[PDB]
């Protein structure tokens, strides 16, 4: 039972549960986190972006993260030995190869979590709507951190794995890629909110209908999880909402399945847009109004006003954000207002 | 706020200019409040759909087996409990639905 | 003088179209119909905004 | 700027607070604050729209 | 001869008619703006 | 204002064909029994 005895050991019952995926997950995962903290504290980003955000100089918690290897460093994967690092550790951190160290070890780790979220099922008996639901961050993670950079000049364009890092990545789209108006991203803001909303409205309704199994005013301990009938009447909740908002759910099944649906579908239809934006297909000027804007300056819409904003962000942010391009803009050239 | 889909976008951006709302902590919680809402909305949506006492044939739709007004429990807690209870450590699984659903509605 | 057209009749997709809020000239003053001099005056200064949100 | 900020946030909560207890106050007087009664559901027997 | 003993009727109740009729229009209402462009 | 000339057909087919396909299935279900 050579292979056999190994199996039942992994599948045994212990504090946590290490499955076949666990072999893949914990080493790959613990390094990601284990890497991120280290790169956060010590490894500077200086030689890469020319601006040091990292925990060991003066920088705070929020503004530290692991930047990315620079543009002219290209799409190379920056292995630890590599041609470029040549097995030298220091210069492998300074180049930000630690970034890629996080993503890849993260992704496989991120995968290894998914597989675990299967391997639990087959030996439990639940249906795997959990893993499948978890494919949305996958798509989001993969699209943002992997497909999007590859659609650019190098790794340099990508989130830097930090609190403030992700922000200079946010405005980075608004200025250049005009992201808010991308309709694939409007389906996202539906999903998330539509998730958050219905998250709160479910939790509220069932919390406002309780059969009063216990005595004391507070009903938490009042619940006995033994072979009970439904702890909250669907009958009330139904006729309830049907008279206020007008439309209710009559199926505990159809309800919850609709919770699983919207956030997921919310992200995927966003993860599509990002891919579409890796190619710089970005949703942008409506040919209708722009031509019309060429027929008079006075015509103005809350669209047209955004184009100036997205224009200012670009010019101002460009020199700092992208030093490699060696941009120098003169003063007057910046698209200042009052002009 | 100019009320409209472009008007709103114009608002935030300009609002971002003056008050630097992103770095503000209260917003930085609001994000957590929305995500964790959407997050929990997925799990509590998922785990219960995952566990369904089967009244349906494989060919037939899985939903229709639920009869409006069933006084049976349509979803096993014991099955789904250990699930999340094995996935992470068994301590945090929130045995009590009445305890869960409240926390489900407090976070967002 | 910059008038803004957020109306739908003028060349606006749903995306671009919006109800413009009230002007600065009106300030924060309560600005109902009758208080405004002319009907077109009440629209040109962004009445319908201040009417809807209330 | 501090006071107006501070007292507002607090004043905001007390709106919620008011809207909290007023719920629990009346429901308490109404007697079913302790949770819907499994024996007889008030909705159970009603004209069904 | 035998007309495929395996067949089933397709069933869509009244509700799942609305969601689609709602979903389609919304997506159109959302994507019509770009199709005009 | 100027526009994609054919963009209108897009909406119509994208509205009707998915819509219709839901009706046809539905009216069937109504006829069951």
């Amino acid at each position: 039972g050579w292979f056999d005895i190994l199996d039942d050991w992994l599948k045994r019952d212990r504090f946590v549960f290490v499955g076949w995926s666990g072999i893949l997950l914990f080493p790959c995962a613990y390094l990601a986190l284990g890497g991120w903290l280290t790169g956060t504290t010590f490894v500077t980003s200086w030689y890469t972006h020319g601006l040091a955000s990292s925990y060991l100089e003066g920088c705070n918690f929020l503004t530290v993260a692991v930047s990315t290897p620079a543009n002219s460093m290209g799409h190379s994967l920056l292995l630890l030995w590599g041609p470029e690092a040549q097995g030298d550790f220091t210069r492998w951190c300074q180049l930000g190869g630690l970034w890629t160290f996080i993503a890849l070890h993260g992704a496989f780790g991120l995968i290894g979590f998914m597989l675990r979220q299967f391997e639990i099922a087959r030996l439990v008996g639940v249906r795997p709507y959990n893993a499948i639901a978890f494919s949305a961050p996958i798509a989001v993670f993969v699209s943002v951190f992997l497909i999007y950079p590859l659609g650019q000049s190098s790794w340099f364009f990508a989130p830097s794995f930090g609190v403030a890092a992700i922000f200079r990545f946010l405005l980075f789209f608004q200025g250049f890629h005009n992201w808010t108006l991308n309709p694939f991203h409007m389906m996202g803001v539906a999903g998330v909110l539509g998730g958050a909303l219905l998250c709160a409205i479910h939790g509220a309704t069932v919390e406002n209908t309780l059969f009063q199994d216990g005595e004391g005013a507070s009903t938490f301990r009042a619940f006995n999880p033994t072979q009970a009938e439904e702890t909250y009447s669907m009958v009330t909740a139904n006729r309830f909402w049907s008279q206020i908002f007008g439309i209710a759910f009559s199926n505990k099944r159809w309800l919850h399945f609709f919770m699983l649906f919207v956030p997921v579908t919310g992200l995927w239809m966003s993860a599509i847009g990002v891919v579409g934006l890796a190619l710089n297909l970005r949703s942008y000027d409506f040919i209708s109004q722009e031509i019309r804007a060429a027929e008079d300056p006075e015509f103005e819409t809350f669209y047209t006003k955004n184009l100036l904003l997205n224009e200012g962000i670009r010019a101002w942010m460009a020199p700092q954000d992208q030093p490699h391009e060696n941009f120098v803009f003169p003063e007057e050239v910046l698209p200042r207002g009052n002009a | 706020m100019p009320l409209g889909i472009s008007g709103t976008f114009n608002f935030m951006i300009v609002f971002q200019a003056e008050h630097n709302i992103l770095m503000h902590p209260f917003h930085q919680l609001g994000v957590a409040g929305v995500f964790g809402g959407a997050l929990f909305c997925a799990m509590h949506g998922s785990l219960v759909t995952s566990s369904l006492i089967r009244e349906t044939t494989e060919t037939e739709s899985a939903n229709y087996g639920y009869k409006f007004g069933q006084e049976e429990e349509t979803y096993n807690i014991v099955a789904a409990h250990g699930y999340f209870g094995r996935l992470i450590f068994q301590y945090a699984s929130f045995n009590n639905s009445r305890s869960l659903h409240f926390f489900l509605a407090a976070w967002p | 003088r910059e008038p803004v057209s957020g109306s739908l009749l003028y060349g606006n997709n749903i995306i671009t179209g919006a109800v413009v809020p009230s002007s600065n000239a009106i300030g924060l003053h309560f600005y109902p119909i009758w208080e405004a001099a002319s009907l077109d005056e009440w629209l040109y200064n962004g009445g319908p905004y201040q009417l809807i949100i209330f | 700027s501090w006071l107006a900020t501070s007292h507002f946030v607090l004043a905001f909560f007390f709106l919620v607070g008011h809207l909290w207890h007023a719920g629990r106050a009346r429901a308490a007087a109404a007697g079913f604050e302790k949770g819907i009664d499994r024996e007889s559901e008030p909705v159970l027997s009603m004209p069904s729209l | 001869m035998e007309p495929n003993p395996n067949r089933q009727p397709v069933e869509l109740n009244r509700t799942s008619l609305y969601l689609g009729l709602l979903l389609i229009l919304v997506l159109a209402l959302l994507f019509s703006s770009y199709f005009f462009n | 204002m100027e526009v994609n000339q054919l963009g209108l057909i897009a909406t119509a087919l994208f509205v009707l064909v998915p819509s219709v396909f839901l009706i046809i299935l539905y009216v069937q279900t109504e006829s069951q029994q």
Binding site: - | - | - | - | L25, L29 | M1, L8
Partner: peptide, 30 residues
Amino acid sequence: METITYVFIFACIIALFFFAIFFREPPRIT
């Protein structure tokens, strides 16, 4: 042309709402 499609699309939404609120088949108990 342009606008008149939006109002149409937006109309059928409303014509769905009023239609979907009142005309739903009541889900009876048992």
